Amino acid sequence: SEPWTVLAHKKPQKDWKAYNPKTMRPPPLPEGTKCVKVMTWNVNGLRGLLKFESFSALQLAQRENFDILCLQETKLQVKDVEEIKKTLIDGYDHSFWSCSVSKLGYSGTAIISRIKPLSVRYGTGTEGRIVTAEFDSFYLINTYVPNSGDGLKRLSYRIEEWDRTLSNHIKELEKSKPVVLTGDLNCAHEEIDIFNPAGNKRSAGFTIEERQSFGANLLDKGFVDTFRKQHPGVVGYTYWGYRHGGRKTNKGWRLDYFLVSQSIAANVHDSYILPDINGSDHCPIGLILKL
Template sequence: MGSKRRSFSNPSSIADQNIDKKLRDAIDNDNYTISDNPILKDIKDDPSKIKAMTIQQLRTALRTAGIPPKGLKRELVSALQSYLAKEIDGESSLLADKQDPSNSDKRISMMMETKSVEDQVQDANSFSKVSEVQQSRRTVKQLQIKGKMVDVNAKIVATEQKKSACASGRMTSLTKKKASSDVDSKYVSAKNRVTLPVNQSEPWTILAHKKPQKGWIAYNPRTMRRSLPIENTKFVKILSWNVNGLRALLKLEGFSAMELAKQENFDVLCLQETKLQEKDVESIKQSLIEGYENSFWTCSNTRLGYSGTAIISRIKPLAVRYGLGISDHDSEGRVVTAEFDSFYLLSVYVPNSGDGLRRLAYRITEWDPSLGNYIKELEKSKPVILTGDLNCAHEEIDIYNPAGNRRSAGFTIEERQSFSTNFLSRGFVDTFRKQNPDVVGYTYWGYRHGARKGNKGWRLDYFLVSEAIADDVHDSFILPDVIGSDHCPIGLVLKL
């Protein structure tokens, strides 16, 4: 007769037949120990039995302990021995914690070290649940890290609306945020540089591009904007914004023109796509910001409530012109020019090539050359600052998805070449790109498909300046946190 051997059943059979209610309750609460488990208790009392166990018995024991039973027999033996050693040490440590509370912090640290990376990702995601915020769910594939344990830190910061002073070169967001529900950033990072962003309330600070090049970084106005020039330095600060309908913007809950002026303290504000009619201008003037008494508007005469540009200034200009002086181009209210002491300033809304590129030929053969000629003529008497929605993402760095928009209005090769030919090649400098050659910063996001939330945008808005004053540009910046339109404002600080 053979000697009697202990029978090892599968875990579910043991749970159903051999474990009493107390043990089942302990398992349900995830707080049972080896002493509660009849299978593991036997080999704990006599670890030498492990090597004599069959592969099936080893796998059953590992399953009972919650460990995936994978590998050859020697690997199963090693896994079970390691588990028992850790559990025995853990039980003694827990007893020590009860006697000396100071040990608890050390114990937590040890437990964190033994957790797998994927477990800690789950911990971080569970802990970071905040009401009313849609968390992006990410499937975290199992990360196999050889060698020593990896410390993993879960950094979870609940944010309130960020406030900063203009003097420090930063902008207070005009977006109404629920402080209790916004998560600024959550990362689960390992020493091997594994970084898993979970959520971000400032999407523009994350590099978003379909095909980013080496060295490209995301534009962050809170760190990249320059502080204002030192005292006793004369300068002018200009903001430009395609508002996509001024009346709608002024009615928007949460938007305050006064707050924008207070925070940015600009001298001149240029607007595009105001969509005003001539009859609306006077009433709009009455609601303007106090201190900005000088305002100049042009509206479309052919299509009511379409296009339109403006310049609003607390500095009185020497003279103002409307249009390019060419009747074929001046019926849609696309250009206002103000002459100041040391420069000309243009607020421009360049025609969109339209669906099916129906206006592409007009755009590149008539409009762009005429605008280029106009500003070169102005430049004969003093430098020129051209700002506004130029409806062209000039380079691949200026658009989230270049490959998918080769024949989209604003990124055709014809428009991009025209931009170079009529403006850049004729001595005008793209101030933002000159200051930030490798920075991805967008100024326009379509309303569909959550483009702004995912920072899937275009850079269509510019400050172009004459080469003669390019080195006097102190800062050229973007304000991506200012909402109210599908575009955001851009700014320029020019030393005089």
């Protein structure tokens, strides 16, 4: 059973088709084409993902042979890094772990690479949400965006504080070299990125305030949503809530993105989703960027 190949939407369109990674993906590049492969996955507790499947990271390298793996919601403490650092995967010696010191066992991002970055820096310019990694031709920012929560308590903090600082961080990097922004942006951009847009108008993640900041602070600053631009009018989800068993019915959201600067957006070859990989409420997404 492949529920992601079936189109589930409350207000769909005739031109829309459900994402099928078997058929809707292009084939890999010729052996030797200078490129870089990046994967992103919200693990919803990395210690819980490994208790479920120990080889979750290895089975990604076996299926895609990525160069860089970006993670969100690792829910790791600063003391838990070294033990995970040795038992997650081999051959990726450059792993950087930003953990949350405010709330313990909460949030937490990571960037695990096999190519040595020129420089890595957490935060802008506490909850482990920003990891900027410099490379020979581009920055790579792995981001886990905070949620407004029940009652939209942090909605003003999300719009006037987080989305503004995140945008200014990305543009200051573009002054040097282009940007590949990945991670859990925690926002369903358009109505095609959610199965029930009408029923979540006031729900955190699909509020109009968050959706306008998705365009203003991010896309309208010279950026492209690779998956949407590669597959215009194609429904694909990267999240399914446990509360309603949404993964068995494909009733989900698209919260994980690969936003790439206009400079190198043409060099994007594939922006895919792997909805068959279980172990978390999210599923991994990938990017194949030509160099």
